[PDB]
Amino acid sequence: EKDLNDVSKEINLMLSTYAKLLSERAAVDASYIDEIDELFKEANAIENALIQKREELRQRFTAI
Amino acid sequence: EKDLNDVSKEINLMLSTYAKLLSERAAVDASYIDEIDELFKEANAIENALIQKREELRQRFTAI
Ligand SMILES: [Cl-]
């Protein structure tokens, strides 16, 4: 007794749910990229600061 | 007046902070993977269900 209209309803409901899942995946990716970007900026700042501390060591070794 | 001991302290502190950043990145990656995995399970369940609904359509089309 389940007819083509019933099956159509189910297909449309599932595709609606898929649209929500796609939107959720985009938001999750944006959040992840945001966190990774902050981490990368901080790691790069640590790297540059380490290069200048290595140059301070170098200057003191040259004074030796 | 800032001696090699001061520079050493600063380098060790920056590398300590870097270790914390690394563990934070690992946690961010685990969290991301957990969310992506749940999304993937849900999307695959939708896909299998849509295949099942396409077969229900197919059976009704065969019924003609
Ligand atoms: Cl790393």
Count of A-B CB contacts under 8 Å: 66
Consecutive H or E run containing B53:
helix B4-62
- Closest among B43, B46, B29 to A36, alpha carbons compared: B29
- Contact yes or no for B18/A42 (Cβ under 8 A): no
Quote the tokens at residue B30.
């685990």
Residue A63 CB-density burial (10 A; 0-12 exposed, 13-18 middle, 19+ buried): exposed
**Domain ranges for chain B:** 1-64
Q: Provide residues of A within 8 Å CB-CB of chain B.
A: 2-4, 7, 10-11, 14-15, 17-18, 21, 24-25, 28, 32, 35-36, 39, 42-43, 46, 49-50, 53-54, 56-57, 60
SS (H, E, C) chain A: CCCHHHHHHHHHHHHHHHHHHHHHHHHHHHHHHHHHHHHHHHHHHHHHHHHHHHHHHHHHHHHC
User: Which residues neighbour A4 within 8 Å (Cβ) at sequence distance 6 or greater?
Assistant: B57, B60
In angstroms, what is the resolution?
A: 2.3
